Design a protein around this motif. Structure first.
Motif, PDB file in Angstrom:
ATOM      1  N   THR A 178       0.857  -1.204   0.000  1.00  0.00           N
ATOM      2  CA  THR A 178       0.000   0.000   0.000  1.00  0.00           C
ATOM      3  C   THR A 178       0.888   1.247   0.000  1.00  0.00           C
ATOM      4  OG1 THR A 178      -1.640  -1.230   1.204  1.00  0.00           O
ATOM      5  CG2 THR A 178      -1.764   1.222   1.293  1.00  0.00           C
ATOM      6  N   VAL A 179       0.561   2.204  -0.844  1.00  0.00           N
ATOM      7  CA  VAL A 179       1.167   3.552  -0.916  1.00  0.00           C
ATOM      8  C   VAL A 179       0.028   4.541  -0.901  1.00  0.00           C
ATOM      9  CG1 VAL A 179       2.727   5.141  -2.121  1.00  0.00           C
ATOM     10  CG2 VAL A 179       3.131   2.654  -2.138  1.00  0.00           C
ATOM     11  N   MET A 180       0.142   5.535  -0.023  1.00  0.00           N
ATOM     12  CA  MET A 180      -0.869   6.607   0.107  1.00  0.00           C
ATOM     13  C   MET A 180      -0.767   7.555  -1.090  1.00  0.00           C
ATOM     14  SD  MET A 180      -2.830   6.271   2.637  1.00  0.00           S
ATOM     15  CE  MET A 180      -2.914   5.361   4.178  1.00  0.00           C
ATOM     16  N   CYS A 181      -1.911   8.025  -1.577  1.00  0.00           N
ATOM     17  CA  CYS A 181      -1.992   9.196  -2.476  1.00  0.00           C
ATOM     18  C   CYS A 181      -2.762  10.256  -1.688  1.00  0.00           C
ATOM     19  CB  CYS A 181      -2.648   8.850  -3.793  1.00  0.00           C
ATOM     20  SG  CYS A 181      -2.918  10.282  -4.856  1.00  0.00           S
ATOM     21  N   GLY A 182      -2.074  11.249  -1.118  1.00  0.00           N
ATOM     22  CA  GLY A 182      -2.703  12.063  -0.070  1.00  0.00           C
ATOM     23  C   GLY A 182      -2.983  11.213   1.131  1.00  0.00           C
ATOM     24  N   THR A 183      -4.252  11.037   1.492  1.00  0.00           N
ATOM     25  CA  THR A 183      -4.680  10.087   2.546  1.00  0.00           C
ATOM     26  C   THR A 183      -5.472   8.933   1.948  1.00  0.00           C
ATOM     27  OG1 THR A 183      -6.883  11.067   3.066  1.00  0.00           O
ATOM     28  CG2 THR A 183      -4.971  11.972   4.154  1.00  0.00           C
ATOM     29  N   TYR A 184      -5.484   8.799   0.620  1.00  0.00           N
ATOM     30  CA  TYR A 184      -6.267   7.738  -0.061  1.00  0.00           C
ATOM     31  C   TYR A 184      -5.341   6.553  -0.310  1.00  0.00           C
ATOM     32  CZ  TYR A 184      -9.612   5.483  -3.149  1.00  0.00           C
ATOM     33  OH  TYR A 184     -10.486   4.618  -3.749  1.00  0.00           O
ATOM     34  N   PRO A 185      -5.589   5.370   0.315  1.00  0.00           N
ATOM     35  CA  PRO A 185      -4.722   4.205   0.139  1.00  0.00           C
ATOM     36  C   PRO A 185      -4.917   3.509  -1.213  1.00  0.00           C
ATOM     37  CG  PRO A 185      -6.053   4.051   2.176  1.00  0.00           C
ATOM     38  CD  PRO A 185      -6.665   5.104   1.285  1.00  0.00           C
ATOM     39  N   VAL A 186      -3.796   3.275  -1.885  1.00  0.00           N
ATOM     40  CA  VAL A 186      -3.710   2.460  -3.122  1.00  0.00           C
ATOM     41  C   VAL A 186      -2.963   1.202  -2.710  1.00  0.00           C
ATOM     42  CG1 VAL A 186      -2.995   2.313  -5.515  1.00  0.00           C
ATOM     43  CG2 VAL A 186      -3.736   4.524  -4.666  1.00  0.00           C
ATOM     44  N   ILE A 187      -3.647   0.045  -2.784  1.00  0.00           N
ATOM     45  CA  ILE A 187      -3.087  -1.269  -2.404  1.00  0.00           C
ATOM     46  C   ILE A 187      -2.645  -1.934  -3.716  1.00  0.00           C
ATOM     47  CG2 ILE A 187      -3.542  -3.465  -1.278  1.00  0.00           C
ATOM     48  CD1 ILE A 187      -5.883  -2.139   0.190  1.00  0.00           C
ATOM     49  N   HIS A 188      -1.354  -1.906  -3.990  1.00  0.00           N
ATOM     50  CA  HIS A 188      -0.765  -2.481  -5.237  1.00  0.00           C
ATOM     51  C   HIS A 188      -0.681  -3.989  -5.057  1.00  0.00           C
ATOM     52  CE1 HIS A 188       0.258   1.483  -6.956  1.00  0.00           C
ATOM     53  NE2 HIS A 188       0.560   1.845  -5.704  1.00  0.00           N
ATOM     54  N   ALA A 189      -1.577  -4.744  -5.692  1.00  0.00           N
ATOM     55  CA  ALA A 189      -1.622  -6.216  -5.564  1.00  0.00           C
ATOM     56  C   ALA A 189      -1.100  -6.848  -6.861  1.00  0.00           C
ATOM     57  CB  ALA A 189      -3.029  -6.712  -5.323  1.00  0.00           C
ATOM     58  N   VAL A 190      -0.046  -7.642  -6.743  1.00  0.00           N
ATOM     59  CA  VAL A 190       0.627  -8.205  -7.950  1.00  0.00           C
ATOM     60  C   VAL A 190       0.181  -9.651  -8.171  1.00  0.00           C
ATOM     61  CG1 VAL A 190       2.793  -8.516  -9.150  1.00  0.00           C
ATOM     62  CG2 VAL A 190       2.525  -6.551  -7.625  1.00  0.00           C
ATOM     63  N   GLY A 191      -0.769  -9.847  -9.067  1.00  0.00           N
ATOM     64  CA  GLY A 191      -1.158 -11.184  -9.518  1.00  0.00           C
ATOM     65  C   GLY A 191      -0.104 -11.740 -10.460  1.00  0.00           C
ATOM     66  N   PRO A 192      -0.087 -13.068 -10.619  1.00  0.00           N
ATOM     67  CA  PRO A 192       0.818 -13.716 -11.572  1.00  0.00           C
ATOM     68  C   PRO A 192       0.403 -13.444 -13.023  1.00  0.00           C
ATOM     69  CG  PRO A 192      -0.790 -15.303 -10.719  1.00  0.00           C
ATOM     70  CD  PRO A 192      -0.984 -14.018  -9.939  1.00  0.00           C
ATOM     71  N   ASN A 193       1.389 -13.349 -13.902  1.00  0.00           N
ATOM     72  CA  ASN A 193       1.137 -13.363 -15.372  1.00  0.00           C
ATOM     73  C   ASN A 193       1.102 -14.825 -15.814  1.00  0.00           C
ATOM     74  OD1 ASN A 193       0.968 -13.063 -18.098  1.00  0.00           O
ATOM     75  ND2 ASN A 193       2.882 -11.869 -18.309  1.00  0.00           N
ATOM     76  N   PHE A 194      -0.055 -15.327 -16.188  1.00  0.00           N
ATOM     77  CA  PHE A 194      -0.261 -16.751 -16.548  1.00  0.00           C
ATOM     78  C   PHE A 194       0.425 -17.054 -17.905  1.00  0.00           C
ATOM     79  CE2 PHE A 194      -3.358 -16.795 -13.105  1.00  0.00           C
ATOM     80  CZ  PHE A 194      -3.191 -18.052 -12.581  1.00  0.00           C
ATOM     81  N   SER A 195       0.973 -16.064 -18.593  1.00  0.00           N
ATOM     82  CA  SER A 195       1.933 -16.318 -19.714  1.00  0.00           C
ATOM     83  C   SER A 195       3.226 -16.958 -19.187  1.00  0.00           C
ATOM     84  CB  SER A 195       2.214 -15.067 -20.491  1.00  0.00           C
ATOM     85  OG  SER A 195       1.034 -14.568 -21.110  1.00  0.00           O
ATOM     86  N   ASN A 196       3.649 -16.618 -17.962  1.00  0.00           N
ATOM     87  CA  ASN A 196       4.983 -16.968 -17.420  1.00  0.00           C
ATOM     88  C   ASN A 196       4.861 -18.125 -16.442  1.00  0.00           C
ATOM     89  OD1 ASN A 196       6.048 -14.802 -18.899  1.00  0.00           O
ATOM     90  ND2 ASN A 196       6.078 -13.435 -17.137  1.00  0.00           N
ATOM     91  N   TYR A 197       3.800 -18.147 -15.615  1.00  0.00           N
ATOM     92  CA  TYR A 197       3.592 -19.173 -14.559  1.00  0.00           C
ATOM     93  C   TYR A 197       2.874 -20.404 -15.148  1.00  0.00           C
ATOM     94  CZ  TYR A 197       5.087 -16.015 -10.869  1.00  0.00           C
ATOM     95  OH  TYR A 197       5.867 -15.233 -10.079  1.00  0.00           O
ATOM     96  N   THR A 198       3.147 -21.581 -14.605  1.00  0.00           N
ATOM     97  CA  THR A 198       2.320 -22.802 -14.803  1.00  0.00           C
ATOM     98  C   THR A 198       0.926 -22.537 -14.225  1.00  0.00           C
ATOM     99  OG1 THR A 198       2.916 -23.809 -12.706  1.00  0.00           O
ATOM    100  CG2 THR A 198       4.342 -24.317 -14.565  1.00  0.00           C
ATOM    101  N   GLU A 199      -0.098 -23.256 -14.670  1.00  0.00           N
ATOM    102  CA  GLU A 199      -1.454 -23.111 -14.067  1.00  0.00           C
ATOM    103  C   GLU A 199      -1.379 -23.307 -12.552  1.00  0.00           C
ATOM    104  OE1 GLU A 199      -4.400 -22.140 -15.339  1.00  0.00           O
ATOM    105  OE2 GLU A 199      -3.387 -21.737 -17.267  1.00  0.00           O
ATOM    106  N   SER A 200      -0.660 -24.322 -12.092  1.00  0.00           N
ATOM    107  CA  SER A 200      -0.537 -24.667 -10.659  1.00  0.00           C
ATOM    108  C   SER A 200       0.102 -23.514  -9.861  1.00  0.00           C
ATOM    109  CB  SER A 200       0.285 -25.925 -10.512  1.00  0.00           C
ATOM    110  OG  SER A 200       0.351 -26.247  -9.147  1.00  0.00           O
ATOM    111  N   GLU A 201       1.257 -23.032 -10.300  1.00  0.00           N
ATOM    112  CA  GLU A 201       1.999 -22.003  -9.539  1.00  0.00           C
ATOM    113  C   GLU A 201       1.255 -20.671  -9.617  1.00  0.00           C
ATOM    114  OE1 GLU A 201       4.157 -23.385  -7.933  1.00  0.00           O
ATOM    115  OE2 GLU A 201       5.446 -21.865  -7.094  1.00  0.00           O
ATOM    116  N   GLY A 202       0.677 -20.393 -10.768  1.00  0.00           N
ATOM    117  CA  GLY A 202      -0.059 -19.149 -10.982  1.00  0.00           C
ATOM    118  C   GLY A 202      -1.263 -19.136 -10.071  1.00  0.00           C
TER     119      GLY A 202
END
Ligand SMILES: [Cl-]
Ligand SMILES: [Cl-]
Ligand SMILES: [Cl-]
Length: 163
Positions: free
Chosen positions: A60-84
Protein backbone atom coordinates in the motif's frame (compact mmCIF):
# COMPACT_ATOMS: atom_id res chain seq x y z
CA UNK A 1 -16.25 -2.30 9.77
CA UNK A 2 -19.39 -1.98 7.55
CA UNK A 3 -22.72 -2.42 9.49
CA UNK A 4 -23.71 -5.29 7.10
CA UNK A 5 -20.59 -6.19 5.11
CA UNK A 6 -21.58 -6.82 1.43
CA UNK A 7 -20.20 -7.62 -2.01
CA UNK A 8 -21.30 -5.58 -5.03
CA UNK A 9 -20.17 -5.35 -8.65
CA UNK A 10 -20.06 -2.31 -10.92
CA UNK A 11 -19.20 -2.08 -14.59
CA UNK A 12 -17.08 1.07 -14.80
CA UNK A 13 -13.54 2.42 -14.40
CA UNK A 14 -12.15 1.58 -10.88
CA UNK A 15 -10.35 5.01 -11.06
CA UNK A 16 -13.86 6.57 -10.47
CA UNK A 17 -14.72 4.30 -7.45
CA UNK A 18 -16.82 5.49 -4.45
CA UNK A 19 -14.88 3.42 -1.87
CA UNK A 20 -12.41 4.38 0.89
CA UNK A 21 -9.44 2.68 -0.86
CA UNK A 22 -8.54 0.98 -4.14
CA UNK A 23 -6.71 -2.20 -5.10
CA UNK A 24 -4.45 -1.74 -8.15
CA UNK A 25 -3.86 -4.74 -10.46
CA UNK A 26 -0.17 -3.80 -10.30
CA UNK A 27 2.94 -5.10 -12.06
CA UNK A 28 5.89 -6.13 -9.89
CA UNK A 29 8.10 -3.17 -10.99
CA UNK A 30 5.69 -0.37 -10.09
CA UNK A 31 5.42 0.70 -13.76
CA UNK A 32 2.45 2.62 -15.15
CA UNK A 33 1.52 -0.60 -16.97
CA UNK A 34 -1.67 -1.43 -18.96
CA UNK A 35 -5.48 -1.49 -18.40
CA UNK A 36 -6.52 -1.08 -14.69
CA UNK A 37 -2.87 -0.31 -13.75
CA UNK A 38 -2.65 2.57 -16.27
CA UNK A 39 -6.01 4.02 -15.07
CA UNK A 40 -4.68 3.85 -11.45
CA UNK A 41 -1.39 5.49 -12.56
CA UNK A 42 -3.35 8.33 -14.26
CA UNK A 43 -5.62 8.90 -11.16
CA UNK A 44 -3.10 8.31 -8.29
CA UNK A 45 0.41 8.65 -9.77
CA UNK A 46 1.85 9.65 -6.34
CA UNK A 47 0.94 6.11 -5.13
CA UNK A 48 3.66 4.64 -7.46
CA UNK A 49 6.56 5.92 -5.28
CA UNK A 50 8.34 2.65 -4.19
CA UNK A 51 5.26 0.58 -5.15
CA UNK A 52 7.38 -2.26 -6.73
CA UNK A 53 6.64 -5.58 -4.92
CA UNK A 54 6.92 -9.30 -5.80
CA UNK A 55 4.27 -11.50 -7.45
CA UNK A 56 1.72 -12.76 -4.86
CA UNK A 57 2.13 -9.67 -2.59
CA UNK A 58 0.35 -6.35 -1.92
CA UNK A 59 2.05 -3.08 -1.02
CA UNK A 60 0.00 0.00 0.00
CA UNK A 61 1.17 3.55 -0.92
CA UNK A 62 -0.87 6.61 0.11
CA UNK A 63 -1.99 9.20 -2.48
CA UNK A 64 -2.70 12.06 -0.07
CA UNK A 65 -4.68 10.09 2.55
CA UNK A 66 -6.27 7.74 -0.06
CA UNK A 67 -4.72 4.21 0.14
CA UNK A 68 -3.71 2.46 -3.12
CA UNK A 69 -3.09 -1.27 -2.40
CA UNK A 70 -0.76 -2.48 -5.24
CA UNK A 71 -1.62 -6.22 -5.56
CA UNK A 72 0.63 -8.20 -7.95
CA UNK A 73 -1.16 -11.18 -9.52
CA UNK A 74 0.82 -13.72 -11.57
CA UNK A 75 1.14 -13.36 -15.37
CA UNK A 76 -0.26 -16.75 -16.55
CA UNK A 77 1.93 -16.32 -19.71
CA UNK A 78 4.98 -16.97 -17.42
CA UNK A 79 3.59 -19.17 -14.56
CA UNK A 80 2.32 -22.80 -14.80
CA UNK A 81 -1.45 -23.11 -14.07
CA UNK A 82 -0.54 -24.67 -10.66
CA UNK A 83 2.00 -22.00 -9.54
CA UNK A 84 -0.06 -19.15 -10.98
CA UNK A 85 -3.11 -20.37 -9.09
CA UNK A 86 -1.04 -20.40 -5.82
CA UNK A 87 0.32 -16.83 -6.39
CA UNK A 88 -3.16 -15.50 -7.39
CA UNK A 89 -4.66 -16.86 -4.12
CA UNK A 90 -1.64 -15.35 -2.20
CA UNK A 91 -2.04 -11.81 -3.75
CA UNK A 92 -5.69 -11.78 -2.54
CA UNK A 93 -4.74 -12.94 1.00
CA UNK A 94 -2.23 -10.01 1.16
CA UNK A 95 -5.04 -7.65 -0.02
CA UNK A 96 -7.26 -8.86 2.88
CA UNK A 97 -4.40 -8.17 5.36
CA UNK A 98 -3.90 -4.65 3.96
CA UNK A 99 -7.67 -3.80 3.95
CA UNK A 100 -7.81 -5.05 7.60
CA UNK A 101 -4.67 -3.07 8.65
CA UNK A 102 -5.98 0.18 7.06
CA UNK A 103 -9.31 -0.05 9.01
CA UNK A 104 -11.33 1.04 5.89
CA UNK A 105 -15.08 0.29 5.75
CA UNK A 106 -15.01 -0.19 1.93
CA UNK A 107 -12.57 -1.23 -0.85
CA UNK A 108 -12.73 -1.09 -4.70
CA UNK A 109 -11.10 -4.27 -6.19
CA UNK A 110 -10.54 -5.51 -9.79
CA UNK A 111 -10.31 -9.27 -10.65
CA UNK A 112 -6.53 -9.92 -10.56
CA UNK A 113 -4.89 -11.80 -13.49
CA UNK A 114 -8.06 -11.55 -15.69
CA UNK A 115 -6.68 -8.95 -18.19
CA UNK A 116 -3.18 -8.82 -19.79
CA UNK A 117 -1.97 -11.39 -17.12
CA UNK A 118 -4.71 -13.99 -17.99
CA UNK A 119 -2.50 -15.89 -20.54
CA UNK A 120 -5.49 -15.47 -22.94
CA UNK A 121 -7.83 -17.53 -20.67
CA UNK A 122 -11.15 -16.64 -18.99
CA UNK A 123 -10.24 -16.57 -15.28
CA UNK A 124 -13.43 -14.81 -13.99
CA UNK A 125 -14.45 -17.75 -11.73
CA UNK A 126 -10.84 -18.60 -10.66
CA UNK A 127 -10.00 -14.99 -9.76
CA UNK A 128 -13.39 -14.22 -8.11
CA UNK A 129 -13.30 -17.37 -5.93
CA UNK A 130 -9.80 -16.43 -4.67
CA UNK A 131 -11.15 -12.91 -3.99
CA UNK A 132 -14.01 -14.45 -1.93
CA UNK A 133 -11.63 -16.87 -0.09
CA UNK A 134 -9.54 -13.87 1.03
CA UNK A 135 -12.17 -11.17 1.65
CA UNK A 136 -15.01 -13.26 3.23
CA UNK A 137 -13.42 -12.92 6.74
CA UNK A 138 -13.09 -9.08 6.37
CA UNK A 139 -15.94 -6.72 7.37
CA UNK A 140 -15.28 -4.09 4.66
CA UNK A 141 -17.92 -3.47 1.96
CA UNK A 142 -16.24 -4.92 -1.20
CA UNK A 143 -17.07 -3.37 -4.61
CA UNK A 144 -15.72 -5.36 -7.57
CA UNK A 145 -15.04 -3.35 -10.74
CA UNK A 146 -15.24 -4.89 -14.23
CA UNK A 147 -15.61 -3.52 -17.80
CA UNK A 148 -17.61 -6.27 -19.66
CA UNK A 149 -21.48 -6.42 -19.42
CA UNK A 150 -21.37 -10.29 -19.48
CA UNK A 151 -18.65 -10.36 -16.74
CA UNK A 152 -20.90 -7.96 -14.69
CA UNK A 153 -23.83 -10.45 -15.02
CA UNK A 154 -21.62 -13.45 -14.08
CA UNK A 155 -20.02 -11.66 -11.08
CA UNK A 156 -23.48 -10.42 -9.92
CA UNK A 157 -24.86 -13.99 -10.26
CA UNK A 158 -21.92 -15.45 -8.21
CA UNK A 159 -22.48 -12.83 -5.44
CA UNK A 160 -26.30 -13.36 -5.28
CA UNK A 161 -25.91 -17.23 -5.30
CA UNK A 162 -24.25 -17.09 -1.79
CA UNK A 163 -27.32 -14.92 -0.73
CL1 LIG B 1 -16.47 4.42 -16.75
CL1 LIG C 1 -4.41 -8.60 -15.37
CL1 LIG D 1 -14.06 -7.20 -17.33
Amino acid sequence: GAMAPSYRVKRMDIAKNDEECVVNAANPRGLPGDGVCKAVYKKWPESFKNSATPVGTAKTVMCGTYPVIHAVGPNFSNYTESEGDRELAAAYREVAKEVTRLGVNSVAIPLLSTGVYSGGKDRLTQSLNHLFTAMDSTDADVVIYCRDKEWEKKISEAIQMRT
